[PDB]
Amino acid sequence: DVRIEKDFLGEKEIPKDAYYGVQTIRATENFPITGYRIHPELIKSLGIVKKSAALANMEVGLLDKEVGQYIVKAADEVIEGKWNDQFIVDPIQGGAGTSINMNANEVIANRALELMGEEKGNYSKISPNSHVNMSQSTNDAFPTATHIAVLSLLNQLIETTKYMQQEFMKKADEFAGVIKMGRIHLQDAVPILLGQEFEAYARVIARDIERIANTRNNLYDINMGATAVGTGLNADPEYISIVTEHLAKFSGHPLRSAQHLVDATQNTDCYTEVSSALKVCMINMSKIANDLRLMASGPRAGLSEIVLPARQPGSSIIPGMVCPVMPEVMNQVAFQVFGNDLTITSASEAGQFELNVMEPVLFFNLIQSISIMTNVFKSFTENCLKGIKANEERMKEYVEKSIGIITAINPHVGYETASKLAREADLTGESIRELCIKYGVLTEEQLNEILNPYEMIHPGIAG
Amino acid sequence: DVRIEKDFLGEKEIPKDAYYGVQTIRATENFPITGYRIHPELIKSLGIVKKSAALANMEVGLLDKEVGQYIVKAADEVIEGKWNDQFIVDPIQGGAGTSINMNANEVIANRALELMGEEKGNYSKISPNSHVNMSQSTNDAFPTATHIAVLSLLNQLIETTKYMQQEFMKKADEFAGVIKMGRIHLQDAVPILLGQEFEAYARVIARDIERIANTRNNLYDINMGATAVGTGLNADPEYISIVTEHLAKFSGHPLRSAQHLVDATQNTDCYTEVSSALKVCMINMSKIANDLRLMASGPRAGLSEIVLPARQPGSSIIPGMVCPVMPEVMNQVAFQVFGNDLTITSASEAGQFELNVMEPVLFFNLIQSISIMTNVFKSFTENCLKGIKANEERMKEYVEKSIGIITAINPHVGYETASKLAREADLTGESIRELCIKYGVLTEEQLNEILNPYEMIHPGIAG
Amino acid sequence: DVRIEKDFLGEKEIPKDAYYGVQTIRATENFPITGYRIHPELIKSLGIVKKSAALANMEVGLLDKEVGQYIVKAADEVIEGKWNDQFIVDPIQGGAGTSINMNANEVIANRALELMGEEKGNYSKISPNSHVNMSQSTNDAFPTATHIAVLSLLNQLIETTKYMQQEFMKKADEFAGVIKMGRIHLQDAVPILLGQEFEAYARVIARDIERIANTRNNLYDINMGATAVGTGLNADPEYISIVTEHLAKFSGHPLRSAQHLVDATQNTDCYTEVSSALKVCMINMSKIANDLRLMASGPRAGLSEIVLPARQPGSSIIPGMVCPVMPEVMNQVAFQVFGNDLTITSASEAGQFELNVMEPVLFFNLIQSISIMTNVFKSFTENCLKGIKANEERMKEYVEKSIGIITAINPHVGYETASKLAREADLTGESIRELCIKYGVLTEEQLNEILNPYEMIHPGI
Amino acid sequence: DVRIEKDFLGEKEIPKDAYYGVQTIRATENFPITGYRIHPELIKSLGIVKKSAALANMEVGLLDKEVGQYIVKAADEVIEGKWNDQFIVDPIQGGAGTSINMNANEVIANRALELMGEEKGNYSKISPNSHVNMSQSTNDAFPTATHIAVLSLLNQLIETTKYMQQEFMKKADEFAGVIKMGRIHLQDAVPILLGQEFEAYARVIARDIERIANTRNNLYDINMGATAVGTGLNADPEYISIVTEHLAKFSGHPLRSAQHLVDATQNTDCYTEVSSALKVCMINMSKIANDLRLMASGPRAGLSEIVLPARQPGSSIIPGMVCPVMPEVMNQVAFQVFGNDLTITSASEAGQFELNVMEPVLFFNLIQSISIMTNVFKSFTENCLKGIKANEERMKEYVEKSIGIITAINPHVGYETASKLAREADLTGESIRELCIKYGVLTEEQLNEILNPYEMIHPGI
Ligand code: NA
Ligand code: NA
């Protein structure tokens, strides 16, 4: 039922059908923290790293082509997502990612052994350390795999967010004629188009796409060849060049060998720069969600400017309640990303000399942020945003009854007079138009032009 | 293979062997955010809530005793942890916890139906809403279950942390004779006992236990009977009294019916008060961990004051490296709790009028904090703290070679003279004792008493 | 125009009329960061510390009675707030607070010298280090002073908060009969009294008062006598017991000498505990302020449930605009405190071995939090909360025309009739009450009982 | 001693000699929160805004040429920093910045009145609202001024940072030959040059310069002309084009009128983008400062790899102590910025519909971050970084007696001999180099090449 493996600390039993090994099992004893598994994209990227390294090591004559070809086939299986269940270590873990790198090394070595008809655990023939980890350290393989995983996930977030942004733009278009009252401080102000607010939403999101896209650039620099500390001592420059080109080609990213491997091994600014752009994006999305929730308030004692698609019963006790559950989950995902960014800040700040050992919790958080933003943006776009409808009559009635349309008469008649009219209209509950007429401030004809609400929506002195 | 269920929004297919229902499946479409499951303690507590309610509702004559007895048996199964797999909704979810409450209501209703020989889905006989949720709202059942789960988890953290605190105290005792140099600003200062530092660690942790224990008090107030908004309109006061006593008795906590149900339904300060005490605790533990990592630095170009149990190979490329992986994972768990507390802050701040809809992400975070602190504290206590050893010779050599022992001569001979001696000793690399003798500041006899390092470890003018 | 002073590092020019000295001037070159000054209460508390130490050192025969007496009189002037302008060092400073301790030691020494007719700078007669700092370290004097300052500031915050909490409870009373629509998810639910919301506000604030008051307890333990690292090297144990008693008696706080001075010198959890309770309080206050600003929304396209006292013009372009400026500044002070608390967290976490050197920024933020909360609570209470008025008729009208008011009538009339009444109410203009009367379902007298605000908003039928 | 002024809300007494007015005095009663004043660069930028608007309004025939000319001269005095003392409102204030805009409008109006020989307060002749605020809102004037202030402050930070970055690169050069032990997890690893660490420092700082410089781009889009909500109601489109050009030309920044003024009036992402780049920079700087403080640990029980310039006595009780005060204040400024960034995050998130009213606290924090970073970078560069010295012999000695130096010799000597050499080195006192010589394994000349600092620290064999 079990086999026995060993490292410099001793021996352990492994289930015979497991592809992980001794260093993996030790990580499960050392760090039973969350019970989560690493993201499958990171597993995939680990497999891209070990395939790339095995090819490069063979090409430069360091690795036996017999063993190397099986390492490559096993790594391809990992890349295709065939072995996600064998990656059992905790995302939150001591040892700076060694246990993640070793989980990859062990799984690939053991699967390679099985593919050449050998016994799993026979590290004499295929060693996790000496073959699958050849020319590598934790301190290059783990971050390089993370750069690749983060880049692949960012590319998916970007595509999802461009889709959402475009759906905001379609709503802006659908609502381009819908007039309502703009509010500042939650006080009635002057008229605005609902489509102008939705375009404001589309535009901030366009700016977020650009910020997030631009954070990829610093992740294209990888540190493969760094060895233990970034000096690259005893790394072969031809190994570095060739592994880099394989990593680029198999991952699909324009990866580059960092110009200064010590810089690239010990600094973590590439990661906080990403987390920062994700946070900024979710600030904007939370604000947008808060607006949607206010606009959907009601149905009788709220603003009731829009109707969201109903997505689930709101209450078992208020008959027929529907709640804005999709904006609410967007807010919650924002609050989660805000927190993840503080965990990332604190972990990046904790780096010491040649290595930041806090990267596992940094990378867990950063991947989680990207992943939950992708998922909530997809679900919000499909289950809410596309289906939003406007209560046009209600919003028109707000404009029809406002005081603040009176703003438009300031350049003609003065803020002082308009204020007197505004105060009176507010205290009597009369229409501001009627008051202008009854006091001879303006004629019916000239305030038909001046108090045109649609015309006040683009710049100019009315008239 | 499937059955069909319905709510006021429409019909859905459910796998025939599933105990969840239509509202559950809708939550899985609305919120595919994390893919996590709610903590099993919360599942258990939901079952305590629905059992308690069913008993109270029968006792006051609202619920049929035939259906009620099966609801109770099903809820007991949930309480014992037999149905954790049927709780499939995302911890991060819109609808303020409705989908969590409905997952409980559905699972219990359906299991109850199966126990009385009926068809799952036959809500005519046993309704998730009308029977299992009777006299309840999301807005009391969900927070009440959370109070119970948080209290049970806090009690386990407290016990784990008292164990850790006691193991720190044992190390303080083991090291009570071990002399070393105290450092301020990382500059050599005056002698201290290693056992005094470990007692400083034990004492802050004692203070953390007290803070965390004291946060339970505000969670003992529950809001069962609140109905939709806290008014309790149409709740039966005898139902409230009786359900409270069952909740207390089955959960083991001294629960109390809040004095003002509107306050208790809309305020979330009980939760941030807990998160705050957890954060403070992890600030202290991170600092302690950082100290341990500095003391274990080396082995030749570091401080090398202590040796930690080796827990995994440190490197595949530095021969025989061992890294302080257990302190490192403690730091990472701190950074995670710091972030979780910011998510909790932001979610509590977002409450509006009669309900804080952001509670799902608040409660996910708070439970995660308590849970990961418990797990890392257990693992750190067993896999590191108990086994720590002191390099007594090294630390003694620091004291033997220090400048700063010279502090003790200030009251005798003046800070001005001691400074001259200190500077000289620092620039020549001579022993400060020899300099005192050679310049006739003190006799060999009087500085044998005065520069006794052990005596400078407790208050007094040396002499 | 200058004198020359000297420390371990060499000599510096000091303005002839200055009471600070060489170690102070160096700090002003090293840390020109914010341009702020330390809080006057911290200056005061430093004066309490140096007075207390001078008395204890004299009593134990370590300090000259005559020189000690002048140190004490100079310290008393500092305590009374006469020399705040001589405390020039930046609150954000390296050195772990040495520069603040030295600013006190120098000002006091020099003023003491002036009081005995000597020249400022004559450290031969009265030394900042040897006399004013005798038996002490930065690492006990500076924290002890901070514990005392923070305690004093907390006591004032608590009194201000208790005043605000009581004014919320008066508004709860004023509004005890005012009915409105409760909202969950911002969706119309069932009726609630405005007074119940204000009471929920007052109750959370009561809980905050308790949390904050309870953070004082760990600050009453001081480390005076710890000297450099908590070992108490060069502090006589009788000096420690005497200085502690003077610190308690002059400060008015029940200070205690910590049970383990090494613990109390290196751990900073008393400070994060305080910051935490301040953050939690401001979370609740921010939420309350958010609710107020929603209730004040309008005048015609908003909820318009309450009217806040007008405090300033809202706009120089929109005629008639007035804005909820006092809830808004409450929000902003919350966001400030949240941030201050993260700075405090990060500084506390950065402690190393025997000393946390990041205390200056930690204490600057903590004292800032306490201070801005006191000031905004006072201003918000006097300029907004006391004057809040309810639009009772508006709120009643929406309750009368809601769906949710059906909930009060359901057990009386049964679900079948309730549904028919609800349907009619949707399609006609009419309130459920009027319809109950029109169709003889309930009598006007029975509806007066059933839809009584208190009765629709409490448990029972 | 007083005059009387009046707004929409009524009349107030103003000190006769004050240039501020009624809306300003009300703000000083409403918000006595911090006691701070807005940054002088924001005052300056407000003056640029009001000058620019007065010129555009005149050009378009909306404002009297004569009154406009006095408004402009008064604005120019504000721009030159002559009236900073008249800006008394608190940076933390409700009203979304109205009180800051009004403080500018009032000071300028009153000074303009004094320049034409009129009485301060005579708003009949020159109105804060009607003339100085003409064609504007708080909601365009205040942000536009902030964009300009922040841009100016960023440009100074960038220049200061570039100076610091270059001084790190000079130290990398000075230390290019200095070998020491690289450490991972604080465990001894393999040799590294001190110069490579300093170059890693310089390179991250280069990346920070780039991030921060790139945040300017979104600030060049301004919303002047948006008026209340971005619709531009009451702003003539030719006024918008002319005021934008004046704003660019007087400020020296390439300002552009935002493409959608409603977007630019309600969204605050340009500000969080800036705060984010500042936070990221200070994360890196804090880490660097942590490393410096570890390298400076000692003198006898620490690493003692570097010596920092001494800047102040470390202790008045421990003789001889000097502390790394300049890295320490760098840490503390980082923690400050981290917190400021959370305040900024929370304020930005709190935007509602057409306006984010939490901008005053957001801008106070953002400007504070930029300002304290500039000041600490300058002071740290001049008072520490330039003067850092290496303990080269100490560092070399530990490299020579390490295990890790074996790594350079392994491919030359093969694993079997390397292990024998390592074992011997552990048990005897002797360095691997000496042992290589003693046992004829390698020649002294071959060891000079192999263990050359540059050669053991770069890829290859
Ligand atoms: Na988190
Ligand atoms: Na701050």
Author numbering:
A (entry chain B), B (entry chain B): 4 to 466
C (entry chain A), D (entry chain A): 4 to 464
Which statements did the authors publish about this structure?
Aspartate ammonia lyases catalyze the reversible amination of fumarate to l-aspartate. Furthermore, a conserved flexible loop, named SS-loop, that contains a two serine signature sequence plays an important role in substrate binding and catalysis. One of the serines acts as a general base in the deamination reaction by abstracting a proton from the Cβ atom of the substrate, forming an enolate anion intermediate. For this, the SS-loop changes from an open conformation in the absence of substrate to a closed conformation that covers the active site in the presence of substrate.
b The variant of AspB carrying the AspB-A1 pocket (T187I+M321I+K324M+N326C) and the loop mutations A422S+Y429D were used further and relabeled AspB-6x. To rationalize the effect of mutations that allowed for β-alanine synthesis, crystal structures of variants AspB-6x and CcAsp-6x were determined to 1.9 and 3.1 Å resolution, respectively. Both variants were crystallized in an apo state: cocrystallization and crystal soaking experiments with acrylic acid, ammonia, or β-alanine did not yield a structure with a bound ligand. While the wild-type AspB crystal structure contains both open and closed SS-loops, unliganded AspB-6x and CcAsp-6x adopted the typical closed conformation observed previously only in the liganded active sites of wild-type AspB. In AspB-6x, the introduced Ile321 interacts with Val193, while Met324 makes hydrophobic contacts with Ala192, Gln190, and the mutated Ile187. Additional hydrophobic contacts are formed between Cys326 and Val328. Thus, the mutations that remove the charged binding pocket for the α-carboxylate group of aspartate may also have a stabilizing effect on the closed SS-loop conformation. In contrast, the activity-enhancing A422S and Y429D mutations that were designed to promote the closed conformation of the SS-loop in AspB-6x are positioned in helix α16 of the small C-terminal domain of an adjacent subunit. In the crystal structure of wild-type AspB, the open conformation of the SS-loop at unliganded active sites is stabilized via hydrophobic interactions with C-terminal domain residues Ile406, Tyr418, Ala421, Ala422, Ala425, and Tyr429.17 Mutations A422S and Y429D disrupt this hydrophobic cluster and thus will destabilize the open-loop conformation and shift the equilibrium toward the closed-loop conformation.
